[PDB]
Every structure is written in structure tokens, then in C-alpha cells.
Scaffold this motif. Structure first.
Motif: not given
Lengths: 349, 871
Positions: B386-411
Motif C-alpha cells: 500500500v505504501k508502494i501504491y502511495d509511492a505510485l501515487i507520488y510517482m503519478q504526482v500531478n497526473s494519474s497515468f489513467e483515470d481507470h488506473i486512478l479508479e483501480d488505485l482507488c479500489g
């Protein structure tokens, strides 16, 4: 010692090899290193001496110091290089281009300062200086005349070299060295740089160990050398010194005061009047610390210095029966100092 | 002497003490004895500075004897059977270590100059002689001596050699030896290296070359790869950060040629890596990437290949990737975001960050791996994922790679949470810590609007639904971050803040961050990113990746301003003061004044937090009323009669005078001057420091500034003196004491002679004293004339023309005529025809008052006609 001492001698040679170990110089030794042919022969002898220093390694000894004959030979070669720097100073003394010759002399002085660091590294080079012309080394005596005459930084390096030499020097040898400083104190000026003055304060601490400087006393006021230096310290203009460096010069003065306090022997004295002014300057520093109210290492150092300053102030009150008479001159500061002392008590933990 | 005889009695005790020094329970007793010895050294210092010096010389002789014993140990040859009965070098070393601990405190107390570097060198030799814990105890004492001494010139190479010996010890250190070894002494060496250049730039290049040899030792050696104590491993990572990351100087050093060697050392440094200290190494790698950045502009692929190898372990199986390796792949994703285009921003962006989609495919594999992991598996490792997922969110920074990927991250974020807050949706949650929930809330907060904007609102509802511990602090951050448009709009946070005005300390810090958005920072949100430019947060976990850029009423602040309170723990305004700490307010100004009054009250004197923030508030009537409340607080402090409370008020008063250009702050300084007059210490000495701080803000002209500073304010100061004159209460000596207080005020003026400054003040003062017309003031004026030893009554006639101008300047009408009659009794015959003879410039001074004089100046002209014999 042994091979490890030889490695330390090699490390000093490596610092000479490094371009430049001295600050503000692009290169040390080599092209900067180089009769002129005799001086070139001396430089080759110094390189052989450096190879010899790599090959071979009480209170005056202090920490055991490796001694290399080659380092002493290098020191004689360094003395010839110092003599060329001295000759530029002698030409300046004769005078009533030259600055470029002085810059070449300054590079030689920087090499001499590197040599002085090497002399601190090697006992034999220090021993050759200790033997001197017959005492002070003849090149060193010329250097002392040069120090009286950038150039101020080189003089500060010479004062630092003298302080290193004084630790190497036996106290009787240091006493023979002592009183060179009294002429130097006259040379030292508020106009002269505070970092150089801090080096002089370090030299003064080495001087305090020397018996002749110990014979010199704060009492006799302005006529006494120590009191006049204290009076300059009391002014503390520190225009060259900035921030922590200004505090460090004050801390060095506090350490010198502590050394005087440790010694059993240590108005009528300018320094006693200066000490009340110095305490007020410490109180102004304390007020800044009180305004700061030690996460920074410099802040932690300042807090230790403030604790040292408070101990010096306690010592000054013990030192003078008329603490109040000194206090009355500093009384506006003293009320702030008492608030600072409460802050220092709060600071203490 | 007699003191020596007392020392001799101590020496008889000392033979008994030596038996005490080595015993099973002796080391605890020796530590007490060492404290007693330190107390005895303090007592010697108390008896005389010289007595401490004599004790120090004896201690130095004892140290020299220990050094001789150390030299014999270093020689390893002859050992004396007795070094004083029977002497054991290990028993002696334990006694020496106890002596050293007292000595290290004593050495700091001694502050010896030119007699300590040799002792430090002896300590370094003793450390070389010392083995394991005994060496470590010596090293810790040496490190304390080193911190006081910086680097000794005398230790020179030997100190570098001792560091090299420590590097050799690091290359071959037992874990038990590492436990014996002190992390703090290693930390002190790390501390000795500067974070930037600083002392490290001061430190010798040859010492730096020894550091390069140290760099060859440990991770370049692979000793770091070999198992090491975690604190020691952290210290080694800190040491690499302290010097290798700093890269101070190094022009003498190989530099870019060294950097290629350092890169080889860095590959050695990565070692096992994923297959913490690695995160510190990653931060050092990020610093190396930062060094590559700009220098590359008029390596990263190799780092990507190393990442690809970690990905390959994840690719072979979810189990095959180490959880630490998965964390390592996540680590530096933010650094990768900082690298390339973010680095180019602070352009061409020729350097390319690793693709998010390739990471997303690994993340999709990681989500499959989490489903693959058994209940015993994952758990805390899943929290790291989950911290790695948080790191991925940090990596996403200003823009999520995909809205669906952001939805997958939210799930993925929802995992443990059910409902509230993704094709799998609830079923993935069904298949699936408060801090983990807080991290999920932070991740939900990090996403804004876009896909699942309602889910983000639902996540805000979930944050409202659960507010516990970190999750409650996260929930307050989440509600603010739930909509950027909601952040732009101004609304009460309510939620936990509504439930408790403090909302608990963790929420209050989050509220302080919301407060940072509020007040001087614009309520409208642009970018709305708290990420800023984070570097490395010390040893702290990175956790969250994170009008101004566009005038706010205290009433608009409403409850949050109300929520801050003296009752509230506060300590300090901190983030909540925010930009405002860095108008026609009306009732909002009154609310601001109440908040200011709470700051003026100061629950904590140290938190008065108020300072600087008050200056910004001064930069930002009601303030005079707040100043009156502060004056009431100062009166309350006098009623309290507590010096610390008085000091806090004095400090606030001093800050206010520097803070405000306006006269009322100068009037407050005059009130501070009245405080300066008051006895019990602090007061003027505190005030003079406060006055100097105000003077620095003032950029004052001294006496010329003082005349502008004084004038009517000086008359108010004179009125305070008049109040003292009114009740001088020691007869002439009491008047002299009042004169001394006036002399102290003249000393505070500090113009020319204090008496000379007073003499210029006195002519103005005499008119002011005449204007007061107190009988006691008149007696004080006669005393002042005696103190002057000047013209006195003859001076008073010269003063009277100025006093008549002062009487023209301020008119009490019939009361002024009664005062003039009182002045006339002092006057006796008075100017009479001479007043008709004079007037002129004194009349001109009445003319100078002009419109402020108004009718009174015309009346003065009529009075002048009466004096002569103008309505």
C-alpha cells in the motif's frame, strides 16, 4: 609510529603533492614549487626528502610526532623557498610587478604554510625550526619580519604556524619565541582581519603557555601588551568576522581566557577594564542567544560558548572584589546579562 | 599547602578508591565516583580558577600516565605488574574509562587551548589501543571531545587514520562488536561531515581521500552488503549521505572520474537492495540523479535496468519479488518524477521518466500478487505494498497515468474499507491499520475530482465516517483536498472540527495546514498542491508526497480562529498562523483583536509564536484597543508580579515597537520606558535591548530620531516623571533619586553628554513641567535646577518664554489661567513688561501651532495685547 608514522609523513608529502592543499592556490608544489639553480637543487633535495619522509617516519613533544631527516632537509629547501618569499618581503622593506613578486612570495608563503602543516606533521622539520639560526630559524626570523610587513592571510598562516611551532616548542624554547608576539600584537590591528586576529588569539593561547608571554601581564594597562590586545578584543568590531566566525573568534578568546584562568598566576589593567567591556560584548551575544531562545550545531556551539562565557563572567566576578564597579560600566548590559543568565539557566539541561 | 594536606587525605582515600575502581559492582560505583570527581573538579574550580587549573594539571598528569599505559599497550611489549599492588591492564582500562568519562566532561569544562589536541591524539591512540567496547567507550569520549574541538590540526593524519581504522572496523565488524560500537560516535562522525560543504569544504582533501578510502570500505567493499547492525547500516547510509551525497569540494578529488568509481561504488552500495538505509541510499541516488540533472543539460537507463531486474523478479512471481524488493522498486519513483521533466522544469525534458504504464502493469501484477498472497502473507507486507501504491501515487504526482488506473488505485486504496470511498468494486474489497487507512485517505485526498469525483466525495464521507488517530488527521486533510473547487470555495470544514473545535491534536495540525490555505494564502485554490519541493524528511517516512498566487476576514475564519485558544494546547500557532504569520475588518478586526489578545496573553511565554506573526499582523483603532488590552495584560502581568510573565509581555512590547511604524507602538515603547523606569530588574535592561530591536527596525537617527520619537511622547515620559515628581516621597535624596532616574532617561537618550542631552531636553521639559504646573513638579524643577547647578530661576525666566509658548501650545482655558496663576506664584513679579518685550519667537511658536492653536492662537494674540497692556 614506524611505518604508520612514515605514512603520516607521506600524507603530509601527499598534501604538498595535492594542488593546492593551501586555500586560494590552484596548485601546490610542482610548477608552483618550481642561487635559483641551488634553489632548484634544493627543490630536488626536498623531493628526495619527501621520498625519504615517505620511507622513514614530553609536553613539547605533545602527541608523538614522526621525525624525518628528509622532512628536515625538505624544510631547509622550504626555508630557501621561504627565503625567496622573504627576499620579496626584504625588497618591500627596502622599498620606501612588485605585487606580482609579492604574489609569488605569497605562493611561497602558502607553500611555507603547507610546509608549516608538514612541520606540525613532522617533528624533525619542527626540530630544525626549534634549533633556528643558533632559537628562531634565520628564515623564520625573516618570516617574522615579513609577518610584521592575502599578505595578512599569509601572516595569519604564519601566526598559525607559530602557534603550531609553539606547541612543538619546549616552554623554554617557546619563551625564547615569546615576545615576538608582543611586536606582533603591535602589528595586529582592528583594521587587520578578524580571522587573522583569531589566528593571533590562537597564537596568544600558545603564547600563554610560553613563560616569557606568561611573564607579560594584563597589569600596566595600555603599556602592558596583554591589556592592549584585550582592549582591541573588548571593542570586538570583528568587521572581517561574520556570524559564527565572529562567534568563533569570541570563543577562541574565551578559550584563551579559560587558559589564563587555569594558570595559577592568572584601570590598573586595560584588560580588566576590557574584560567588563568583553563581558558586555558576551552579554550582547548572550542577549542574541536570549533572543534566539541549539538544534543548529553552531547554535549548540553558541550555547556551549554562552555557558563558557557565563563561567568566565562568574570568574570575572570572583576575580574582582569590585564586581559592581566593573558591573556599573556594564550595568545596562548587566540587567540584560542577568536576564540572559536566567535564559542560560533555562538553556542548561 | 593546607589544601594540599586535604588533597593528601583524599590520596589516602584514593588508595582505598583504587580497590573501589575495579570490582563487579565498581563500574556503577566508578561512574558515581567519576561524577563525584567531576564535582570535586567543579569544587576545585569553585575554590579557585587556579585550584581547578592545579586539579587539571594533576588530571593531565593522570592522563599522561594513562597515555604512557596506552603507549605500553600500543607497544604490546613490557607490561608493569603494578601501575599505581597488582595492576591488570583491562582493570586499569575500565578505571581509565571511568576517569575518561569524568575527564571528557572536565575537558569540555577545561576548554584547554594548545593542551587538548595532543590529548585528543592520545585519545585517538587510546582508541587504536582500545578493543571493542573499551575502544567504543573511548571513541564516544573522543567524539564528544572532537565535537568541542572540531578537528585537531595535531591529530592530522592520525585522526584521518582513526577514521580509516573505523572504516577497516566497518569492513570487518562483528554484530556483537557493532552492538559494542556506538552509533552515536558514528553519528558524530556523520555529523562532523557537513550536509553541504561547510566544515567538509574546510576538511582536508587528504581527509576526503581517506573518506574515499572509507567509501571503498563498507558498501564498495560489500561489507555493507554483508549483514550489519541496522543502526550501523543506517549510520553507514547516513555517512554516505553526509559525505558522498554532499560531494563537498572534491576539485582536488577525482570528481567525475571519482563519480564513475562512485557509480561503481553505488552499484556495490545497492548490493542486495530490495533482494530505509536503501531508501537513504535511494535519496543519495536521487542526489546523484540531481547531480546528473543540469550537468546532462547543455545512467538513468542503467537505474531503469536495475529497476527492470526488480520488476523481473516481480514478473516471475508475486512471491518471487521480495516485499523489500517491491518496496525498493516503488522507492525513487518520486525521485524519477523529480528526474527528467520535473528536473527539466527546475525545459527540453530530453531525459525521459520511466513509463507509468510499465509501472502500472507491474502495479496490476502487484494487485494480482496481493490477491495471490495468503492471509499470513501480505498484511504488514501488504501495508508496504500500500505504501508502494502511495509511492505510485507520488510517482503519478500531478497526473494519474489513467483515470481507470486512478479508479483501480482507488479500489486498491479501498481494500480494507467497505463502501463509502473499479470493475471488481466491492468484491475486490471483500477479497481484501489506522495508519494504513490514513495512507488510503491521503491517497484518496491526493486524487482530485476527475474519475470517481463522487467516489472522492464518498471517500471524504468515509473520512468523515472514520476519524481515528492518523486517519483523523488524514480525514481533515482529505476533506480540504476532496475537491480543488471545494478548496477554492470558502466553507466551514465542520466534520471532526465541528465535533471538537480542536478536533484532537492530530486534526489540529491538519487544521493548521487547512489554516495555511486560509488567511493570507488565497481561499481560491490554484494548483492546490502541498507537494512543493520535498527532499528527504530526515529519518522520517516519506508518507504523503506533498490572496496568495491570485483580504480575509477573521469573521470569515470564523470557528477555526475561535478554535485556537489559550485553553487549546497550541504550542504553537505553527502552520495555523501560516501565510498570515509570514482593511475595514470591523467586527472581523475585533475577532482578530480577540485572537491577538489570546496571543498577547500567551498560554506559553515561549510561544509568543506571536513574534514575527505580530509583525506581519502589524504590516496587515481596533489595533489600538488590542494594544490597550495588551497594556491591560501588562497591568495584569504587574498584578501577577511574575518575572517570566513580565518578560513575555516586555518581549511582546519590544516586538510590537519594532513591528509597528505607527505612534501608538511608539507610545507602547514609552509605556515600555515606564516599565524601564520600574525596579525589580529586567525593565530598562530588557527595555534597552527591546529599544535596540525597535531602533534596528527604526533605522533611527539617534538623537534626531529621538526628537521625532519624543516630543509629545517625551512630554508623556515627562508626565510619568511628573507622576514620580508628584510622589517623590528621602527628601532631597529622593528628589536626587528622581533626578538619577531622569539621568538614566538621559543616558537612554545617549546624546553627547547624558547631562548635555538632558540640558537640551530640560528646556523642552521646563515648558512641559510648567504645563503640568504641579507644586511637587515645581519643587522637582527647583531640584532639577539645583541638579543642573545652572541659571536655575534665571534659566526659568528664559524657560518661561518657552513655557509661555507651551502654555499657548496647550490651553486649559480657565484652568490654564489658574495654572498661569500657579506659574505666576513661581513667577513672582514675572516677565511683565519683559513678556511684552519678548513674545516674538515665543509668539511665533504660538503662531506655529496655527490651526491646531486655532482660536487659542487668536486668543493668544488677544492675551499678547493684554500682556502688552486682537479679538
Amino acid at each position: 609510529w614506524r611505518q604508520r608514522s612514515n605514512t603520516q609523513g607521506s600524507i603530509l608529502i601527499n598534501l604538498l603533492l595535492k594542488q593546492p592543499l593551501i586555500p586560494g592556490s590552484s596548485l601546490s608544489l610542482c610548477h608552483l614549487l618550481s642561487s635559483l639553480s641551488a634553489l632548484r637543487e634544493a627543490q630536488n633535495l626536498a623531493f628526495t626528502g619527501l621520498n625519504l619522509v615517505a620511507r622513514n617516519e614530553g609536553g613539547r613533544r605533545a602527541f608523538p610526532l614522526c621525525q624525518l631527516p628528509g622532512a628536515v632537509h625538505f624544510l631547509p629547501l622550504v626555508q630557501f623557498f621561504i627565503g625567496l618569499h622573504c627576499q620579496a618581503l626584504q625588497d618591500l622593506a627596502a622599498a620606501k610587478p612588485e605585487d606580482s613578486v609579492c604574489i609569488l612570495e605569497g605562493f611561497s608563503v602558502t607553500a611555507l604554510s603547507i610546509l608549516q602543516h608538514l612541520v606540525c606533521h613532522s617533528g624533525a622539520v619542527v626540530s630544525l625550526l626549534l634549533s633556528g639560526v643558533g632559537g628562531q630559524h634565520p628564515l623564520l626570523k625573516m618570516l617574522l619580519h615579513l609577518l610584521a610587513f592575502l599578505q595578512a592571510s599569509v601572516l595569519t598562516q604564519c601566526l598559525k604556524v607559530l602557534v603550531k611551532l609553539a606547541e612543538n616548542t619546549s616552554c623554554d624554547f617557546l619563551p625564547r619565541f615569546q615576545c615576538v608576539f608582543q611586536v606582533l600584537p603591535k602589528c595586529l590591528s582592528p583594521e587587520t582581519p578578524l580571522p587573522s586576529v583569531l589566528l593571533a588569539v590562537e597564537l596568544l593561547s600558545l603564547l600563554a603557555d610560553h613563560d616569557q608571554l606568561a611573564p607579560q601581564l594584563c597589569s600596566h594597562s595600555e603599556g602592558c601588551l596583554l591589556l592592549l590586545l584585550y582592549m582591541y578584543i573588548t571593542s570586538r568590531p570583528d568587521r572581517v568576522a561574520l556570524e559564527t566566525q565572529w562567534l568563533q573568534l569570541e570563543q577562541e578568546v574565551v578559550w584563551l581566557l579559560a587558559k589564563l584562568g587555569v594558570q595559577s598566576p592568572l584601570s590598573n589593567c586595560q584588560c580588566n577594564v576590557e574584560v567588563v567591556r568583553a563581558l558586555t560584548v558576551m552579554l550582547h551575544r548572550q542577549w542574541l542567544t536570549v533572543r534566539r531562545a541549539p538544534r543548529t550545531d553552531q547554535q549548540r556551539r553558541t550555547v556551549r560558548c554562552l555557558r563558557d562565557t557565563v563561567l568566565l563572567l562568574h570568574g570575572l566576578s570572583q576575580k574582582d572584589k569590585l564586581f559592581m564597579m566593573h558591573c556599573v560600566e556594564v550595568l545596562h548590559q548587566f540587567d540584560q546579562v542577568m536576564p540572559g543568565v536566567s535564559m542560560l539557566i533555562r538553556g542548561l539541561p | 599547602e593546607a589544601k594540599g594536606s586535604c588533597i593528601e587525605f583524599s590520596n589516602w582515600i584514593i588508595t582505598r578508591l583504587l580497590r573501589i575502581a575495579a570490582t563487579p559492582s565498581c563500574h556503577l560505583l566508578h561512574k558515581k565516583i567519576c561524577e563525584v570527581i567531576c564535582s570535586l573538579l567543579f569544587l576545585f574550580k569553585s575554590k579557585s580558577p587556579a585550584i581547578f587549573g592545579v586539579l587539571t594539571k594533576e588530571l593531565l598528569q593522570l592522563f599522561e600516565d594513562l597515555v604512557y599505559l596506552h603507549r605500553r599497550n600500543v607497544m604490546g611489549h613490557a607490561v608493569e605488574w603494578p601501575v599505581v599492588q597488582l595492576m591488570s591492564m583491562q582493570n586499569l582500562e575500565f578505571i581509565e574509562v571511568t576517569l575518561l568519562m569524568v575527564l571528557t566532561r572536565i575537558i569540555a569544562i577545561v576548554f584547554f587551548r594548545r593542551q587538548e589536541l595532543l590529548l585528543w591524539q592520545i585519545g585517538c591512540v587510546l582508541l587504536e589501543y582500545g578493543s571493542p567496547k573499551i575502544k567504543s567507550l573511548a571513541i564516544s569520549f573522543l567524539t564528544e571531545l572532537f565535537q568541542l574541538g572540531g578537528l585537531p590540526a595535531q591529530p592530522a593524519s592520525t585522526f584521518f587514520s582513526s577514521f580509516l581504522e573505523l572504516l577497516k572496523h566497518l569492513v570487518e565488524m562483528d554484530t556483537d562488536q557493532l552492538k559494542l560500537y556506538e552509533e552515536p560516535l558514528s553519528k558524530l562522525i556523520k555529523t562532523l561531515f557537513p550536509f553541504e560543504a561547510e566544515a567538509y569544504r574546510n576538511i582536508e582533501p587528504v581527509y576526503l581521500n581517506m573518506l574515499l578510502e572509507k567509501l571503498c570500505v563498507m558498501f564498495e567493499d560489500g561489507v555493507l552488503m554483508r549483514l550489519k547492525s541496522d543502526l550501523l547500516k543506517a549510520a553507514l547510509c547516513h555517512l554516505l549521505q553526509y559525505f558522498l551525497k554532499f560531494v563537498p569540494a572534491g576539485y582536488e578529488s577525482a570528481l567525475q572520474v571519482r563519480k564513475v568509481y562512485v557509480r561503481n561504488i553505488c552499484k556495490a552500495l545497492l548490493d542486495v537492495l530490495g533482494i530505509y538505509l536503501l531508501g537513504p541510499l535511494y535519496a543519495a541516488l536521487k542526489m546523484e540523479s540531481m547531480e546528473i540533472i543540469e550537468e546532462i543539460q547543455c545512467l538513468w537507463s542503467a537505474l531503469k535496468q536495475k529497476a527492470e531486474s526488480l520488476q523481473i523478479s516481480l514478473e516471475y512471481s508475486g512471491l518471487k519479488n521480495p516485499v523489500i524488493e517491491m518496496l525498493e522498486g516503488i522507492a525513487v519513483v518520486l525521485q524519477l518524477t523529480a528526474l527528467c521533466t520535473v528536473h527539466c522544469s527546475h525545459p527540453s525534458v530530453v531525459i525521459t521518466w520511466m513509463s507509468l504504464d510499465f509501472y502500472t502493469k507491474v502495479l496490476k501484477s502487484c494487485r494480482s500478487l496481493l490477491e495471490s498472497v495468503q492471509k499470513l502473507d501480505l498484511e504488514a507486507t501488504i501495508d508496504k505494498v500500500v505504501k508502494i501504491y502511495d509511492a505510485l501515487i507520488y510517482m503519478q504526482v500531478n497526473s494519474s497515468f489513467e483515470d481507470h488506473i486512478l479508479e483501480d488505485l482507488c479500489g486498491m486504496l479501498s481494500l480494507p474499507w467497505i463502501y463509502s470511498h473499479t470493475t471488481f468494486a466491492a468484491n475486490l474489497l471483500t477479497l481484501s491499520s489506522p495508519q494504513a487507512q490514513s495512507r488510503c485517505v491521503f491517497l484518496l485526498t491526493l486524487f482530485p475530482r476527475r474519475i470517481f469525483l463522487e467516489w472522492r466525495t464518498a471517500v471524504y464521507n468515509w473520512a468523515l465516517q472514520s476519524s481515528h488517530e492518523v486517519i483523523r488527521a488524514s480525514c481533515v486533510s482529505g476533506f480540504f483536498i476532496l475537491l480543488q473547487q471545494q478548496n477554492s470555495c470558502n466553507r466551514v470544514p465542520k466534520i471532526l472540527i465541528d465535533k471538537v473545535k480542536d478536533d484532537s491534536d492530530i486534526v489540529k495540525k491538519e487544521f493548521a495546514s487547512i489554516l495555511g490555505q486560509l488567511v493570507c494564502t488565497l481561499h481560491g485554490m490554484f494548483y492546490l498542491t502541498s507537494s512543493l519541493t520535498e527532499p528527504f524528511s530526515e529519518h522520517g517516512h516519506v508518507d504523503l508526497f506533498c490572496q496568495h498566487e491570485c483580504q480575509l476576514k477573521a469573521s470569515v475564519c470564523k470557528p477555526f480562529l475561535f478554535l485556537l485558544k489559550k485553553k487549546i494546547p497550541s504550542p504553537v500557532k505553527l502552520a495555523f498562523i501560516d501565510n498570515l504569520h509570514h482593511r475595514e475588518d470591523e467586527t472581523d478586526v475585533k475577532a482578530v483583536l480577540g485572537t491577538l489578545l489570546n496571543l498577547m496573553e500567551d498560554p506559553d511565554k515561549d510561544v509568543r509564536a506571536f513574534s514575527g506573526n505580530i509583525k506581519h499582523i502589524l504590516e496587515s483603532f481596533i489595533k489600538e484597543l488590542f494594544v490597550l488590552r495588551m497594556k491591560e495584560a501588562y497591568t495584569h502581568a504587574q498584578i501577577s508580579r511574575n518575572n517570566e510573565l513580565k518578560d513575555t509581555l516586555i518581549l511582546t512590547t519590544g516586538d510590537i515597537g519594532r513591528a509597528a511604524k505607527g505612534d501608538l507602538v511608539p507610545f507602547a515603547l514609552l509605556h515600555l520606558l515606564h516599565c524601564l523606569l520600574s525596579k525589580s530588574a529586567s525593565v530598562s535592561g530588557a527595555a534597552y535591548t527591546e529599544i535596540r530591536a525597535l531602533v534596528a527596525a527604526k533605522s533611527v537617527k539617534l538623537q534626531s530620531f529621538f526628537s521625532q520619537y519624543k516630543k509629545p511622547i517625551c512630554q508623556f515620559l515627562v508626565e510619568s516623571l511628573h507622576s514620580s515628581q508628584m510622589t517623590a516621597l528621602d527628601v532631597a535624596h529622593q528628589r536626587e533619586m528622581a533626578l538619577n532616574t531622569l539621568s538614566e532617561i538621559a543616558n537612554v537618550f545617549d546624546f553627547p553628554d547624558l547631562n548635555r542631552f538632558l540640558t537640551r531636553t530640560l528646556q523642552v521639559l521646563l515648558p512641559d513641567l510648567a504645563a503640568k504646573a504641579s507644586p511637587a513638579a515645581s519643587a522637582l524643577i527647583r531640584t532639577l535646577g539645583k541638579q543642573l547647578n545652572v541659571n536655575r530661576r534665571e534659566i526659568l525666566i528664559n524657560n518661561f518664554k518657552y513655557i509661555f509658548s507651551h502654555l499657548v501650545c496647550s490651553c486649559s482655558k480657565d484652568e490654564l489661567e489658574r495654572a498661569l496663576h500657579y506659574l505666576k506664584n513661581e513667577t513672582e513679579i514675572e516677565l511683565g513688561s519683559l513678556l511684552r518685550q519678548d513674545f516674538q519667537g515665543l509668539h511665533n511658536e504660538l503662531l506655529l501651532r496655527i490651526g491646531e492653536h486655532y482660536q487659542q492662537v487668536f486668543n493668544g494674540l488677544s492675551i499678547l495685547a493684554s500682556f502688552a497692556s486682537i479679538i
